[PDB]
Amino acid sequence: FAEHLSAHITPEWRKQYIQYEAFKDMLYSAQDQAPSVEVTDEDTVKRYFAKFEEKFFQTCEKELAKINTFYSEKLAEAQRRFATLQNELQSSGSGSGDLKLAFSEFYLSLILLQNYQNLNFTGFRKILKKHDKILETSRGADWRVAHVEVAPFYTCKKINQLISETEAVVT
């Protein structure tokens, strides 16, 4: 998925996606640098993983907030763009094709935003699955359900509504 994500990210938006590869690095580091109980003790091992989990879920929260923020900003930009294009159509009519092209480009922008939603959800799902495999826990799955699956970027259906509305113009 690291390769897929890189391949399908929208370039101008790169920093706004879940930092999937960085999370993989974090998890591989956690595994590599883990103390052994035989060389240390149970206290030391449990402290190590508790500290790692704190850092991991803080990073998940920061990434989730980033994604919600960017999605919200891009949705607001899309709502304003639709209003502009609709106002042009009602004032001056279809014209000779420039407005059809503008609506086509706007529709593309909506589909890119919908793909941003899906790709970031899949990235969170896959990184929390990898976390749970490596640490032999279900804490990541629970976090997905309790935090990602209720997150505004994921639940929002306003883009869906704009897509439907845009289709009923370009009809």
Describe this structure in words.
- It is classed as transferase.
- Keywords: transferase, Inositol diphosphoinositol pentakisphosphate kinase, Analog methylenebisphosphonate, PPIP5K ATP-grasp, Pyrophosphate Diphosphate.
- The assembly is monomeric.
- The chain is mainly alpha-helical and 171 residues long.
- It is elongated and about 80 Å long.
Could you tell me how far the N terminus lies from the C terminus, measured between alpha carbons in angstroms? 36 Å
Q: Please trace the helix and strand order, writing H or E for each element.
A: HHHHHHH
SS field, number of helical segments: 7
The major β-sheet equals: none
Silhouette: elongated
Task: Please summarize what this structure is.
Residues 1-171 are cytoplasmic. The chain is mainly alpha-helical.
Element layout with pairings:
Layout: H1 2-8, H2 20-32, H3 42-92, H4 98-135, H5 139-148, H6 152-155, H7 158-167
Helix pairs in contact: 2-4, 3-4, 3-7, 4-5, 4-7
List keywords for this structure.
elongated, mainly alpha, Inositol diphosphoinositol pentakisphosphate kinase, PPIP5K ATP-grasp, Analog methylenebisphosphonate, transferase, Pyrophosphate Diphosphate, 78% helix, 171 residues
